[PDB]
Design a protein around this ligand. Structure first.
Ligand SMILES: N#Cc1ccc2c(CN3CCOCC3)cc(-c3ccc([C@H]4CCC(=O)N4)cc3)nc2c1
Length: 17
């Protein structure tokens, strides 16, 4: 679920913020 875009500064689940 969470913990993937922390590595991009995007945090979590969105279809591109
Ligand atoms: N929590 C969370 C979470 C969970 C899934 C996510 C998925 C789909 N999953 C499907 C399963 O395999 C890994 C991808 C895509 C994206 C995502 C895709 C592209 C970008 C664009 C714009 C920003 C950038 O650098 N790229 C930003 C965010 N963010 C997600 C965030």
């Amino acid at each position: 679920l969470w913990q993937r875009r922390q590595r991009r500064g995007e945090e979590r689940k969105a279809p591109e913020n």
